[PDB]
RNA sequence: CCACCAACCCCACACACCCCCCCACCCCCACCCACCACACAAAACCCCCAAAACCCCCCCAACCCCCAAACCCCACCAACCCCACCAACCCCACAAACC
């Protein structure tokens, strides 16, 4: 529901879980990250 | 570093479907005598003349030490980011855009 989504993020103080973070990178590092796009985005933000 | 409509297994004739099959067969077994890729005997350390045996030795000797003065592969001065044109800086920007 968007009200559970809403509350969840509010528990976490709106930043994202580290879940969130191992998953945005290791679909970014598993890919052939392009020069401006979104893979290449979420590489250079996340990656340590 | 998406896209032709549409269809969207680099599926589909049928019959089929072990890269099975002639039969006898079926150790890439078999003549016999054999059967250590053993062997003349004498004999077997790829041992031996003696004298010997540091791939030791003339002596002086014995730092691949030494003129002297010396001894940072220091030193003109000015210096002393292998900094510096300014304007200043994402190796950013027409617009429209951005599998």
């Not at 509350?7 to 191992?22: A, D, E, F, P, W």
């Amino acid at each position: 529901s968007p009200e559970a989504v809403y509350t969840r993020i509010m528990m976490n103080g709106g930043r994202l879980k580290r879940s969130h973070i191992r998953r945005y990178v290791s679909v970014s590092s598993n890919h052939q990250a392009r020069p401006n796009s979104f893979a290449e985005f979420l590489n250079k933000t996340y990656s340590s």
